[PDB]
Ligand binder design. Structure first.
Ligand SMILES: Nc1ncnc2c1ncn2[C@@H]1O[C@H](COP(=O)(O)OP(=O)(O)O)[C@@H](O)[C@H]1O
Ligand SMILES: [Mg+2]
Length: 378
């Protein structure tokens, strides 16, 4: 069976395979080309991917996500301490190692973060296998450039327990560059900036490629800035609107909020191609159907400060790598949030009209690159 490339993301994962000189990003059962990094446990089953995310609103304590934030980390870790204050599922301490605790089939169980990630990895494997019609064994999995030895180990382990022979763990920025062929030798040093604005993390990496050898000169970003924050701005906006028209605050009702957030995320996606989108939610609060809409203009202004602040980490990355705007040769967009028109305008204006590399869907770029690398490695 061919070796596959797997992008194990914080919010979404994606799998691609290199066949006949072309890379194919494989779609799941629901036809999506990316699958949520979600796992859910119920009375009767274990849900993974779309099925898991599609039921979070009613099973918050038993629906796990953000496992990538825990992987390879300790319970005492300040990061873990801060983060766990925001998850509806519980994190327990098992001899210094953090574990997620859920109720599966009425019984209480706990999993190490690598076990949860292995579940998502298993889903990608069977998605590839379904498509290929053959067993998938070898794989190249990607990881952020900033992951340390423990995090890389844990990611590798998540793979082995998923029945995957991890050929190699390569950095996400490097994978993105390989997708565009920016790794080909042109007899000269090339500086490339990877702008990765995903579902929950933002990362800016500056790579220097010489003779086909990558060198991460600098990196910057924010581990808590992503498409989720954009959705939230919309949510808070609609909560206020609902209160105006119906004099009813729905903030307390967790289900109404979660359903609204789902509708916002979807509208947001439409806003990247259309200038307006409608939100049609039946019986949002009590028996009130919430029918409304948003314009791209309004969306842009709701997140103006967030979008704009995106340039700060870019300036920082530049100065650390000791380069001027003019010195970077290529700029590649990675992450689902980069499909947002305002973000593309903003970055391009910053780089004085420089063209952006974005022919490959940004949320598929890393998987795409990993597949090519998997191919050569086999
Ligand atoms: N058309 C789009 N416009 C804006 N955001 C989008 C669009 N398509 C996907 N997204 C967003 O991208 C994020 C997913 O990013 P992705 O790169 O797939 O994952 P990850 O950050 O997990 O690596 C989500 O916040 C999703 O709403
Ligand atoms: Mg990503």
């Amino acid at each position: 069976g061919p070796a596959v490339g797997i992008d194990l993301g914080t919010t979404y994962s994606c799998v691609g395979v290199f066949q006949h000189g072309k890379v194919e990003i494989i779609a799941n059962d629901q036809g999506n080309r990316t699958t949520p990094s979600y796992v859910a446990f119920t009375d009767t089953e274990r849900l993974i991917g779309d099925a898991a995310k599609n039921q979070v609103a009613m099973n918050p304590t038993n629906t796990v996500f953000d496992a990538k934030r825990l992987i390879g980390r300790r319970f005492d870790d300040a990061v873990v301490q801060s983060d766990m204050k925001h998850w509806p599922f519980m994190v327990v301490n098992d001899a210094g190692r953090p574990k997620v605790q859920v109720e599966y089939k009425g019984e209480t169980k706990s999993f190490y973060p690598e076990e949860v990630s292995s579940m998502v990895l298993t889903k990608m494997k069977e998605i590839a296998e379904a498509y290929l019609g053959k067993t998938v064994t070898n794989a190249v999995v990607t990881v952020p450039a900033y992951f340390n030895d423990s995090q890389r180990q844990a990611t590798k382990d998540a793979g082995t327990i998923a029945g995957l022979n991890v050929l190699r763990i390569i950095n996400q920025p490097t994978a993105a560059a390989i997708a565009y062929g920016l790794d080909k030798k042109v007899g000269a040093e090339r500086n490339v900036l990877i702008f990765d604005l995903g579902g929950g993390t933002f990362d800016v990496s500056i790579l220097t490629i010489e003779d086909g050898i990558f060198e991460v000169k600098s990196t910057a970003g924010d581990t808590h800035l992503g498409g989720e924050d954009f959705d939230n701005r919309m949510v808070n906006h609609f909560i206020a609107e609902f209160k105006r028209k119906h004099k009813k605050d729905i903030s307390e009702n967790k289900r109404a909020v979660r359903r609204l957030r789902t509708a916002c995320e979807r509208a947001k996606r439409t806003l990247s191609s259309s200038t307006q989108a409608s939100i049609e939610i039946d019986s949002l609060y009590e028996g009130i159907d919430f029918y409304t809409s948003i314009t791209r203009a309004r969306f842009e202004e709701l997140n103006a400060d967030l979008f704009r602040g995106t340039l700060d980490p870019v300036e920082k990355a530049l100065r650390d790598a000791k380069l001027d705007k003019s010195q970077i040769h290529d700029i590649v967009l990675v992450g689902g949030s980069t499909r947002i028109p305002k973000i593309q305008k903003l970055l391009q204006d910053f780089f004085n009209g420089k063209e952006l590399n974005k022919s490959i869907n940004p949320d598929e770029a890393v998987a795409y690159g990993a597949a090519v690398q998997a191919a050569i490695l086999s």
